[PDB]
């Protein structure tokens, strides 16, 4: 506890490595996002989709185009995340069918975690900061498509109140990926051993980075509960549309994950 020794040094090194890897794997960092969202960036201003009109001009059926755009991005997000996971010390030294498992059950949690970086009260940044689509507009979407992102915005405004930065999220995201309780893991003890290490790293990171804010570590770990709820409810809502809308197509790589 609050001791600058070899053990802590090693933990900071692990924080730094994770951070550096996160920057390399994740193009739109939270820091860039918040700049754009606060008008701080003197870089180019994004187009604001707030209605059907502004959706069209910006594009230069609706609900189904936007849904398919969310699934294409969902899939680049899985490539992004896969790369990161591989950078986590100990990850590639695991059974390739614990790697596939941790990523199968992990990706969606990470996706909604990081999506929060792109969100404020008003909406979400899209296409790497070139666009911004309003919360209320996503709601105005035809049923059932207007209920998908709503609960993410509810998650995001609470989560963003914690004021985590990329440093923090880097380690947090690792903690999630290495979750010791995903179905069908062969070698559970190694995964837990790495996560113990990450969890020490995160605790120390949070103490250093957040002097004013205590039980942040606690308050953060509880977010993993909210995340799993969100993913569950997301699947249930995807089950419905795959019934209601039995005419459109759902990318086959997501279907690989979703069915379990
Ligand atoms: C017209 C293009 C729309 C933007 C496409 C996605 C953006 S960012 C983004 N990325 C994801 C990733 C996942 C989700 N899942 S979700 O919130 O449950 C969701 C909300 C609404 C609809 Cl219609 C479908 C879905 Cl699945 C949403 C998003 S929004 C991008 O940069 O390309």
From Swiss-Prot:
Tissue expression remark: Highest expression in adipose tissue. Lower in skeletal muscle, spleen, heart and liver. Also detectable in placenta, lung and ovary.
Chain residues that bind rosiglitazone: 71-74, 108, 234, 258
Domain statement: The 9aaTAD motif is a transactivation domain present in a large number of yeast and animal transcription factors.
A molecular function (GO) term: STAT family protein binding
Protein name per its UniProtKB record: Peroxisome proliferator-activated receptor gamma
Changes after translation: Phosphorylated in basal conditions and dephosphorylated when treated with the ligand. May be dephosphorylated by PPP5C. Ubiquitinated by E3 ubiquitin-protein ligase complex containing FBXO9; leading to proteasomal degradation. Ubiquitinated at Lys-24 by TRIM55 leading to proteasomal degradation. Ubiquitinated by E3 ubiquitin-protein ligase STUB1/CHIP; leading to proteasomal degradation.
Induction and repression of expression: (Microbial infection) Expression increases when incubated with M.tuberculosis or its lipoprotein LpqH; induction is TLR2-dependent (at protein level).
Regulation: PDPK1 activates its transcriptional activity independently of its kinase activity.
Entry function: Nuclear receptor that binds peroxisome proliferators such as hypolipidemic drugs and fatty acids. Once activated by a ligand, the nuclear receptor binds to DNA specific PPAR response elements (PPRE) and modulates the transcription of its target genes, such as acyl-CoA oxidase. It therefore controls the peroxisomal beta-oxidation pathway of fatty acids. Key regulator of adipocyte differentiation and glucose homeostasis. ARF6 acts as a key regulator of the tissue-specific adipocyte P2 (aP2) enhancer.
Quaternary assembly: Interacts with FOXO1 (acetylated form). Heterodimer with other nuclear receptors, such as RXRA. The heterodimer with the retinoic acid receptor RXRA is called adipocyte-specific transcription factor ARF6. Interacts with NCOA6 coactivator, leading to a strong increase in transcription of target genes. Interacts with coactivator PPARBP, leading to a mild increase in transcription of target genes. Interacts with NOCA7 in a ligand-inducible manner. Interacts with NCOA1 and NCOA2 LXXLL motifs. Interacts with ASXL1, ASXL2, DNTTIP2, FAM120B, MAP2K1/MEK1, NR0B2, PDPK1, PRDM16, PRMT2 and TGFB1I1.
Disulfide bonds: none
Short motif 9aaTAD, span: 252-260
Disease cited in the entry: Defects in PPARG can lead to type 2 insulin-resistant diabetes and hyptertension. PPARG mutations may be associated with colon cancer. Obesity: A condition characterized by an increase of body weight beyond the limitation of skeletal and physical requirements, as the result of excessive accumulation of body fat.
Keyword Nucleus carried by entry: yes
Keyword set, alphabetical order: Activator, Biological rhythms, Cytoplasm, Diabetes mellitus, Disease variant, DNA-binding, Glycoprotein, Isopeptide bond, Metal-binding, Nucleus, Obesity, Phosphoprotein, Receptor, Transcription, Transcription regulation, Ubl conjugation, Zinc, Zinc-finger
NR LBD domain span: 10-260
Family, as annotated: Belongs to the nuclear hormone receptor family. NR1 subfamily.
Cellular component aspect of the GO annotation: chromatin; cytosol; intracellular membrane-bounded organelle; nucleoplasm; nucleus; receptor complex; RNA polymerase II transcription regulator complex
Superkingdom in the source lineage: Eukaryota
Cross-link (Glycyl lysine isopeptide (Lys-Gly) (interchain with G-Cter in ubiquitin)): 24
Biological processes, Gene Ontology terms: BMP signaling pathway; cell differentiation; cell fate commitment; cell maturation; cellular response to hypoxia; cellular response to insulin stimulus; cellular response to low-density lipoprotein particle stimulus; epithelial cell differentiation
Organism for this UniProt entry: Homo sapiens
Gene transcribed to yield this protein: PPARG
Primary localization class, coarse: nucleus
Region Interaction with FAM120B, annotated ranges: 3-52
Subcellular location: Nucleus; Cytoplasm
């Amino acid at each position: 506890s609050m001791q600058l020794n070899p053990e802590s040094a090693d933990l900071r090194a692990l924080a730094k490595h994770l951070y550096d890897s996160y920057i390399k794997s994740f193009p739109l960092t939270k820091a860039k996002a918040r700049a754009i969202l606060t008008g701080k960036t003197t870089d180019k201003s994004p187009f604001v989709i707030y209605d059907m009109n502004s959706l069209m001009m910006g594009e230069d059926e609706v609900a189904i185009r936007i849904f398919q755009g969310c699934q294409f991005r969902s899939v680049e997000a899985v490539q992004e995340i896969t790369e990161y996971a591989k950078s986590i010390p100990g990850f590639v030294n695991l059974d390739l069918n614990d790697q596939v498992t941790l990523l199968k059950y992990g990706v969606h949690e990470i996706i909604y975690t990081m999506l929060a970086s792109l969100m404020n009260k008003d909406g979400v940044l899209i296409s790497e900061g070139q666009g911004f689509m309003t919360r209320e507009f996503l709601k105005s979407l035809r049923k059932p498509f207007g209920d998908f992102m709503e609960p993410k915005f509810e998650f995001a405004v609470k989560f963003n109140a914690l004021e985590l930065d990329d440093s923090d999220l880097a380690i947090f995201i690792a903690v999630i990926i290495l979750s010791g309780d995903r179905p069908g893991l062969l070698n559970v003890k190694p995964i837990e051993d790495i996560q113990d290490n990450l969890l020490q790293a995160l605790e120390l990171q949070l103490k250093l980075n957040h002097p004013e804010s205590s039980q942040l570590f606690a308050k953060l770990l509880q977010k993993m509960t909210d995340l799993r709820q969100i993913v569950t409810e997301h699947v249930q809502l995807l089950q419905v549309i795959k019934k209601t809308e039995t005419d459109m197509s759902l990318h086959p790589l997501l279907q690989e994950i979703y069915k379990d």
